[PDB]
Amino acid sequence: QANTMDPQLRMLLEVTYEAIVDGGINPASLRGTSTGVWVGVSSSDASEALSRDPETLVGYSMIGCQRAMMANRLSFFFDFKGPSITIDTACSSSLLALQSAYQAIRGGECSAAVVGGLNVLLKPNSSLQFMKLGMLSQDGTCRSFDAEGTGYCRAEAVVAVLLTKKSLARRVYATILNAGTNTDGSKEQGVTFPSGDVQEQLIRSLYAPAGPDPESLEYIEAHGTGTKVGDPQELNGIVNALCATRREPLLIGSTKSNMGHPEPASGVAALIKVLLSLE
Amino acid sequence: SQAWDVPSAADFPSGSSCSSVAVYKFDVSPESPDHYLVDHCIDGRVLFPGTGYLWLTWKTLARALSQNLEETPVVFEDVTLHQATILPKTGTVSLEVRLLEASHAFEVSDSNGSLIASGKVYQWESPDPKLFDTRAAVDPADSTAEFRLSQGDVYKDLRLRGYDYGPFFQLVLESDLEGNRGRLQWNDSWVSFLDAMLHMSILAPGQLGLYLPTRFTSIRIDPVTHRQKLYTLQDTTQAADVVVDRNLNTVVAGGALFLGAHSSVAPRRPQEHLKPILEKFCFTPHVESGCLAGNTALLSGLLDAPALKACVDTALENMASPKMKVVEVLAGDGQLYSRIPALLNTQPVMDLDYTATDRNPQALEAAQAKLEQLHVTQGQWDPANPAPADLLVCNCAGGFLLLHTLDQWESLFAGASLHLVALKRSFYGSVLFLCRQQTPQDSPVFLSVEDTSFRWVDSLKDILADASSRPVWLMAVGCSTSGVVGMVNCLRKEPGGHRIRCVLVSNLSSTSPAPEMHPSSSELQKVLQGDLVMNVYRDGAWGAFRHFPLEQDRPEKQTEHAFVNVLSRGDLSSIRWVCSPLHYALPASCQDRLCSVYYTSLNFRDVMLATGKLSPDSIPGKWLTRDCMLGMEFSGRDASGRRVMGMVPAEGLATSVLLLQHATWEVPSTWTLEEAASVPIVYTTAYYSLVVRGRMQPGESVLIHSGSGGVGQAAIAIALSRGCRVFTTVGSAEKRAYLQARFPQLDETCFANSRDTSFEQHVLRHTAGKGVDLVLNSLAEEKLQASVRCLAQHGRFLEIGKFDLSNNHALGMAVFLKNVTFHGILLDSLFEEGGATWQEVSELLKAGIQEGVVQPLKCTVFPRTKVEAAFRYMAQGKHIGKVVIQVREEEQGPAPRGLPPIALTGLSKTFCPPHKSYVITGGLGGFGLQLAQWLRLRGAQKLVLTSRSGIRTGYQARQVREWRRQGVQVLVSTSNASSLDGARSLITEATQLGPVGGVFNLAMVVSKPKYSGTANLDRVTREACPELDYFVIFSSVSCGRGNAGQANYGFANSAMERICEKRRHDGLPGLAVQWGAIGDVGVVLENDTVIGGTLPQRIASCLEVLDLFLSQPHPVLSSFVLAE
Amino acid sequence: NSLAEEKLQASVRCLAQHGRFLEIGKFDLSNNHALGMAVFLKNVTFHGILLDSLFEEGGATWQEVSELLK
Amino acid sequence: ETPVVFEDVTLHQATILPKTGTVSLEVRLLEASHAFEVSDSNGSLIASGKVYQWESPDPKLFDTRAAVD
């Protein structure tokens, strides 16, 4: 029943253990909790692979591949009796999972959560679709910000973080001050077009009058895809919202340049780069 | 630790839908559901069932059909299997099946895109159940007698031939002796059921050797009727009836019937990790002086020839347990750490603690690369005494001490209270000293053992209560055949007598003038002081019985008679001079036809066979042994002194040869015996082809390929004589040359190429697109296909070459509208079987010769030595005419009536004169029956097999029943040899069939079959067997190193081992063989076990080991295989 | 033989060694069907037979055929 | 890039394109047998033979010479 498990889920079950104990908590202390699990997953490739040969491939591969299991089976083994959920929003996802959990904790529901992001690149057909939409970089690289930006360069990762209420954390990397999401309305320029005018809005909703002082920002981690169209749209609306202030406000950067756009994992993969450096 | 299944690159869709290609991946590790496949073991490899490809393909069909297997009654046609697949113990192998749904074709590829299998498959639309009818001759009132073959009897005879079928595949339950009827077990697996059907086909009587499938012509399965045909035994298991009809070549079983399932020979691949240990069993004195002095040949300071082990041995069985802690001082220089870890590892009951200690850490450095592999505990030590304990060894170049320097020595041992156990004095001043330092003795018990009654046995079973009677000594003064030596080895390590210090003393004077055996006096103590476990005495030397390795050289002989045959199909480094069966005997009957060779010539087949490009399956004639099969042309002189030239169905490459009336001709006063030795095959082949079969008439046109060649030149000559248009093709510029010179009537229009298809063009030009009248093809694939096209209307295709035929290639059936006729031409098919048609061919030679038409071809002449080379030369098409081997400088000028003096280095192979009779007691026994078979093959016509009840098994009935149909004279006897009156009855029984030349004692139950029988037969054989060639007896290493629970089996054996050494001394044949575990059908299986720290010798190995032994000097020899 | 496909194929199999296949029928020939080239090891010989090919080409071979009738 | 070779190709029926609508033709390829075969929508036999990559493409084959003016 293991050889018919999607490797994401395999190494998810490991990292989220590696993660809980990372924060000085013995996993077992959480057994039976109202603790929950949110997973940002966009690509379940392994799932289709073991679903073709209708004499070869067995029936319990689906207990090990069906997207819902990316969380349901993490909830299962750790005994987390709180919300178990997978979200798909393309590249966003994992970050929006981390948003979704924070909110659940914030308002009662949970005392802690598993936020996970997963993306594994198995079928080439996937990339082939991307390339035909031009978003893949032939150069094979993420020129974060630079002008030589063709497209992005897909990369994989399983990442997970443990949220919790402070009155329960044996270790704190950082505190979440705010988070929210919106959705690029209907742009005239097509669906793939990043609306910086909308991203600009989202960044305001969470600062100035309704949250922290735009002046306290030391560093902002960008999506930083490396799109000839994306990059500018984003960084523009950034300053167009965060910059009525002195000094060299936000030193900016992208992990996606270091390693590649981990797609739906992107959000939490990035967070990790951040927390890592902070320490 | 464990790494898991990562869906791969190539695992997701990569083109579009195709209800018509499938890849199947097969895992054979014990976990896999397809582990059942490991039971299709063959010759030691796990090969994917030929039958399996059919299953795969069949599955594949129903897939494409949206249906399941049980709904798709399938039909196959012309299926061919090309290579088979060798499943590795682990990992996966992939097999793809592709399906041409309109062509009905199919084809199976492997991961490497190789051709595995191909044919036609489709849904059978009108499945007629009357095809699988299982009806009989009539009512057989024949059960409780009958004789059938038991599931065991079957896969036994198979695993003999090479088929190591495992449990999941042993589905033949029962079977008619002839292999025509039976019962196959259902397994809920078609792969198995089908392959079992094949089993049955393979199971003809008299059919030998290893055979896989290769072609089916028309398989036809209908699972609908297969359900109905099936039934349930009382076993609760399932099965159905199977029938074989080799007149119709169809096998039918339940709901599947094969039609035309040809299979074919494969080569057995010796696995050289099962190479048995061959030791001799000479007596060895403790007083060997002047040793060596024969070695024509540092090498001089280092004396590792046999007499090292000679004492290491003595020392080794002189402790209770097969565990010996050995050590060695001064180790880095006098290097004993390289030898004895080999001398002990030789025996199958070793437990070695070796210690290599040198004064410095320095000399123990070339040893880290050695002591590592040898597993030797190293250290530091200097000859001044202090010791940081079974034997110690040392090279100066109450346990044991071996030493080696280069009288004064013998008093340096008197001081340390040592007794010189052994002394080996070399001719060059190299002497070996073994030393045992003795701990005071106890109550020395003494029991003699000469009395037939075995009274001493309740006497020795009493000496087992005695707590610690350290010296317990067995002996025998009477019987020169006491079997103590063997008895001992058995008790010397049986629980009760472990530390018993079981010693022995024996009297085996071999000549009548050689007495000297008196106890209680002087020498009783000389041998008690040495304390040696084993003390024997022959004509004056005090030594024990030692096992030395064998001298190894495949025994040669000085023969006037020998022939040559590749010792292994495919490789010419094992081409050798084989003793010819005329060297063993020549009955007046075959005798007038005898004839001595001066020249023998290679022909193409001699080559292609010694290669392995052409199977022995495509050779006409029915063959005893498909072995010796090389050589068909020769020249010399018959017993008339006369001067001849001729052909021979096989074994032509030889000193001497038996003519064939209808294919020997007189060689003309004007022809060197050399030139003569090239003519027969070639022109015979030419005329059979052009004249007799193609009916070539004058002024017709003919395309003769490779006129450069031998057959070519002849073909050309003949076609010129009836003056036709010649078109020859040729590989080399220089070959155009030769031909042009030799045949002057040739234009340049006559020549095209052969490296090529070009010749079709060339022949179509100067033919005016008309084509040629006859083509004499001996050419490849695309090239044959192209020769067919040079066919003029009404013309004839003469097909010599056999490659394309052999592979059932396809022929474009519309060439037949040109009113063409296509000729398959194998002169082999005539020739031996010397019919009218052949006599016609011969008289075209006779005539052709007397009209100059036929002429000698250029010869490239190799000496009788460089024979190998002669092959590689003809291998490379780099010749013009015949390649010939000279065996006798021909007799010169003035008319020489000769008498030849040929001495030849000929390797020994045992052969049976066909007038002699051979006797095997315990002859219907698993192993006996095989020696019976093996004897026959080596030519035996007269067998006397002995058993107690007579023939009781089906598998016994079968062998004997057949051998009689093959015309072997076989007498099953109920006579026992342990009674002189019975023994005389037996040897007499045999004498009726003809002079007794062989007596093999295999009967076993204890010391009446073995000892008393052996004894009697020795006598009777002496009295009245003046033509006895062999006298053999089967021992067992039970007598060797010893078995716990067979001290009675032990005595009896060692006994025969004496009477053999008797006959040897007396100039007679004699030979006891100490077998390890005997395999395929011995008392063991009735093959992966470990009895006595060994391995069951596969009888096949045994039989060829016997070859070797049967032609040896020494009386007693051991053969067993090592465990680990 | 003057017979269909599988049936011709099957007639080829009734060939004894050294035997001869007399091929009259033209269907299988006409469609360049395949012939199992290993029937030729039986030292068999295979005959394409169209009497048409002689007939008006009133050759020697044909005069022989006529005098077997006479 | 694929200098091809055919062998023994046979055409069996031919295909009658209708003034309108579409007709389908499938080609299947036995890569070890070098065989091939063309089916139509109705699973009928259209064409069959051998095809493969020509390894030593010898240009002297397409010489348009011969010496008769």
Q: What is the full DSSP assignment across B842-885?
A: HHHHHHHHHTT-S-PPPEEEEESSTHHHHHHHHHTT--SSEEEE
Q: Which residues on adjacent β-strands are paired with residue C21?
A: C46
Backbone φ and ψ for B523, nearest 5 degrees, come out as: -85, -20
Cβ distance A266 to A95 under 8 Å?
yes
What three-state secondary structure class fits B1011?
helix
Note whether C23 contacts B816, CB cutoff 8 Å.
yes
Helical H runs in chain D? none
Residue linked to tokens 């497209």: A151
Asked if B6 lies within 8 A of A7 by C-beta distance, the reply is yes
In chain C, what are the helix, strand and coil shares in percent, each to the nearest 5? 45, 15, 40
What span, in angstroms and rounded, lies between the C-alpha atoms of B27 and B630? 43
Contacts (Cβ under 8 Å, ≥6 apart) of A27: A17, A20, A21, A78
Task: Report how far residue B764's alpha carbon sits from residue B779's, in angstroms, rounded to the nearest whole number.
Answer: 18
Closest to B236 (Cα-Cα) out of B170, B174, B186, B175: B186
Please, do chains A and C touch (3+ CB pairs < 8 Å)? Answer: no
Answer whether B4 sits within 8 Å of A124, measured CB to CB.
no
Chain C partners within 8 Å of B806 (Cβ): 38, 41
Q: Which residues, 6 or more positions from B1119, have their beta carbon under 8 angstroms from its beta carbon?
A: B276, B277, B278, B279, B1073, B1074, B1075, B1076, B1097, B1102, B1105, B1109
| Amino acid, res. A216 | S
SS3 B559: strand
- Pick the catalytic residue from A65, A110, A142, A261: A261
Burial class (CB in 10 A: 0-12, 13-18, 19+), B91: exposed
Please tell me which of the candidates B98, B101, B118 has its beta carbon nearest to residue D39.
B101
Look-up: residue for tokens 């400088």?
Answer: B889
B865 sits in the region (left: phi over 0; alpha: psi -120 to 50; else beta) called: alpha
CATH architecture of A1-279: 3-Layer(aba) Sandwich (3.40)
- In the sheet that holds B503-506, the strands lie side by side as B283-285, B541-545, B534-538, B503-506, B472-476, B445-448
φ/ψ of residue B762, rounded to 5: -55, -40
Choose among B327, B316, B334, B151: nearest CA to B237: B151
Q: What is the C-alpha to C-alpha distance for residues B810 and B785, in angstroms, rounded to an integer? A: 9
The span from the CA of B622 to the CA of B627, in Å, is 12
Q: B19-272, superfamily in CATH?
A: Polyketide synthase dehydratase (3.10.129.110)
The set of residues, in sequence order, having a beta carbon less than 8 Å from that of B895 and lying 6+ positions away, is: none
The residues near B799 (Cβ < 8 Å, ≥ 6 apart) are B777, B784, B805, B822, B823, B824, B825, C40
Q: Is the dihedral of CA B191, B196, B201, B207 positive or negative?
A: positive
Experimentally determined by: X-ray
End-to-end CA separation in angstroms for chain B: 30
A204 Cβ under 8 Å from any chain B Cβ: no
Q: What is the 3-state secondary structure (H, E, C) of B110-144?
A: ECCCCEEEEEEEEECCCCCHHHHCCCCCCCCCCCC
Q: Does B220 touch chain C (CB under 8 A)?
A: no
- The CA-based dihedral angle spanning residues B542, B544, B549, B550, taken in that order and rounded to the nearest 10 degrees: 60
Domain B552-910 has CATH 3.90.180.10: yes
Question: Residue B344 corresponds to which amino acid?
Answer: L
Q: Where in the sequence numbering do the catalytic residues of B fall?
A: 40, 195
Site of tokens 């096992």: B547
SS (H, E, C) B185-213: EECCCHHHHHHHHHHHHHCCCCCCCCEEE
Would an 8 Å CB–CB cutoff place B1 in contact with chain A? Answer: no
B109–chain D Cβ distance below 8 A for any pair: yes
Chain A neighbours, 3+ Cβ pairs < 8 A: B
B596, B655 in Cβ contact below 8 A? yes
Q: Report whether B1118 belongs to an annotated binding site.
A: no
Show which subunits contact B, needing at least 3 CB pairs below 8 angstroms: A, C, D
Sign of torsion over alpha carbons B924, B928, B930, B935: negative
Distance in angstroms (rounded) separating the CA atoms of residues A45 and A32:
32
Q: How far is B764 from chain A (nearest CA, A)?
A: 54
Question: How many whole angstroms separate alpha carbon B908 and alpha carbon B471?
Answer: 48
Mutation site, B98, B108, B757, interface D, largest D CB count within 10 A: B98
DSSP reduced 3-state for B930: helix
CA-closest candidate to residue D9, choices B812, B480, B947, B1057:
B812
Task: In whole angstroms, give the CA distance from residue B73 to residue B34.
Answer: 24
A81 Cβ contact partners less than 8 Å away, ≥ 6 residues apart: A32, A33, A34, A35, A75
List of chain B residues whose C-beta atoms are within 8 Å of the C-beta of residue C33: 813-814
| Multiple choice CATH, B439-551+911-1124, 3.50.50.60, 3.40.50.10740, 3.30.70.100, 3.40.50.720 | 3.40.50.720
- Residue found under tokens 């008895």: B487
Angstrom distances, CA of residue B619 to CA of B684, B711, B842, D23: 18, 19, 21, 54
**Cβ proximity of B358 and B332 under 8 Å:** yes
Token representation of residue A254 = 């992208």
Half-sphere exposure in the Cβ direction for D35 (13 Å, CA): 21
Kindly state whether B415 is in contact with chain D, defined as any CB-CB distance less than 8 angstroms: no
Q: Which two tokens stand for residue B1051?
A: 């005595």
Angle of helix B710-721 relative to helix B679-687, nearest 10 degrees, comes to 50
Q: Within an 8 Å CB–CB cutoff, is residue C41 touching chain B?
A: yes
Q: Give the torsion sign (CA, D44, D47, D49, D55).
A: negative
What distance in Å separates residue A50's CA from the closest CA in chain B?
8
Residue keyed to tokens 């080399």: B732
Nearest to B49 by CA among B203, B244, B239, B189: B189
Range list of H helices, B326-454: 340-343, 371-374
Which residue, chain included where needed, has tokens 């990369």? A155
CA A270 – CA A276 distance, rounded (Å):
10
Spatial CB neighbours of A209, under 8 Å, sequence gap ≥ 6: none
Cβ–Cβ gap B817/C47 under 8 Å: no
Q: Does B975 count as an annotated binding residue?
A: no
Q: Is the Cβ–Cβ distance between B230 and B186 less than 8 Å?
A: yes
B619 is in an annotated binding site: no
CA distance B813 to chain C (A): 5
**Count of other CB atoms within 10 angstroms of residue C10:** 16
Q: How far from B630 is each of B217, B562, B651, B739, CA to CA, in Å?
A: 32, 13, 5, 29
Q: How far is B1042 from chain C (nearest CA, A)?
A: 57
User: Which positions in chain B touch D30 (Cβ < 8 Å)?
Assistant: 98, 100, 105, 107
Residue corresponding to tokens 């523009």: A236
Dihedral, CA of residue B623, residue B629, residue B631 and residue B633, to nearest 10: 0
Structure tokens at B636: 């010399």
Within an 8 Å CB–CB cutoff, is residue D51 touching chain B?
Answer: no
Contact between D35 and B100 using a beta-carbon 8 Å cutoff: yes
Within 8 A by CB and 6+ apart from D39, the residues are: B101, B102, D25, D26, D27, D28, D45, D46
Interface test with D, best of B101, B761, B811 (most D CBs within 10 A): B101
Q: For residue C20, how many C-alpha atoms fall within 13 Å in the half-sphere facing its CB?
A: 7
Nearest to C24 by CA among B817, B795, B798: B817
Residues B7, A49: C-beta atoms closer than 8 Å:
yes
- For residue D66, the one-letter residue type is A
Task: Decide if A123 contacts A45 (C-beta within 8 A).
Answer: yes
Residue B949 is assigned to a ligand binding site: yes
Give the count of beta carbons closer than 10 Å to the beta carbon of residue B264: 15
Q: Whose CA is closest to B791, among B756, B750, B763?
A: B763
- HSE at residue B425, side-chain half, CA atoms within 13 A, is 8
The residue ranges of every structural domain in chain A are 1-279
Q: Is C3 exposed, middle or buried (0-12, 13-18, 19+ CB in 10 A)?
A: middle
For the four alpha carbons of B951, B954, B955 and B960, in that order, the dihedral sign comes to positive
Q: Select from A46, A38, A40, A52 the least CA-distant residue to A10.
A: A46
Question: Measured between beta carbons, which residues in chain B are less than 8 angstroms from residue D31?
Answer: 109, 113
Amino acid at B547: H
Angle between helices B836-850 and B679-687 (to 10 degrees): 110
- Resolution in Å equals 3.2
Which residues in chain D are contacts of B20 at CB distance < 8 A? 28
Residue B1091 to residue B1095: CA distance in whole angstroms: 7
Q: Residue C53: which of B802, B819, B829 has the nearest Cβ?
A: B819
| CA nearest to D5, candidates D51, D62, D64, D60 | D51
Report d(CA B644, CA B635) in Å as an integer. 6
Structural contact between residues B10 and B130, judged by C-beta atoms closer than 8 angstroms? no
Q: Which of B935, B923, B922, B931 is CA-nearest to residue B968?
A: B935
Shortest distance between the Cα of D43 and any Cα of chain B, in A, equals 6
Q: Which of B100, B101, B113 sits opposite D32 (nearest CB)?
A: B113
Say if A48 is an interface residue toward chain B (CB within 8 Å).
yes
Residue type, B921: T
Q: Which residue of B has its CA nearest to C20?
A: B823
Q: Binding-site residues of C, please?
A: 24, 49, 51
For residue B936, what is the enclosing H or E element? helix B926-937
d(CA B225, CA B215): 25
φ and ψ of B662, to 5 deg: -75, 5
CB of B591 within 8 Å of a chain C CB? The answer is: no
**Per the CB < 8 Å rule, is B12 touching A7?**
no
Separation of alpha carbons B631 and B627, rounded Å: 12
Q: Locate tokens 């063993």: which residue?
A: B584
Tokens, residue B368: 């880290």
Helix (H) or strand (E) run with residue B339 in it? none
Q: Which residue of D30, D31, D32 is in closest CB contact with B100?
A: D30
3-class SS of residue B583: coil
Q: Amino acid identity, residue B762?
A: H
Q: How far is CA B529 from CA B421, B723, B967, in A?
A: 9, 98, 63
Measured CA to CA, the distance from residue A227 to residue A235 in angstroms comes to 12
Question: Nearest 5°: phi and psi at A56?
Answer: -75, -55
- Please work out, in degrees rounded to the nearest 5, the angle formed at the alpha carbon of residue B963 by the alpha carbons of B958 and B965: 95
By CB atoms closer than 10 A (0-12, 13-18, 19+), residue A191 is: exposed
Backbone angles phi, psi at B480, to 5 degrees: -70, 20
Contact B80, B121 (CB under 8 A): no
What amino acid occupies position B540? G
DSSP structural state of residue B983: H
Q: What is the 3-state secondary structure (H, E, C) of A104-126?
A: HHHCCCCCEEEEEEEECCCCHHH
User: Is A65 one of the catalytic residues?
Assistant: no
B234 is written with which tokens? 């009382």
Binding-site entries of C for NADP(+): 24, 49, 51
> Distances in Å between the alpha carbon of B477 and those of B505, B1016, B1055?
8, 21, 14
- Please check whether residue B1119 is in contact with residue B1075, taking contact to mean a CB–CB distance below 8 angstroms: yes
Residue written as token pair 């024949």 = B142
DSSP assignment string, B615-638: -GGG--S--S-SSS----EEEEEE
Residues of D in contact with B109 (CB under 8 A): 31-32
| Contacting residues of B for C43, CB less than 8 Å apart | 620, 824-826, 829
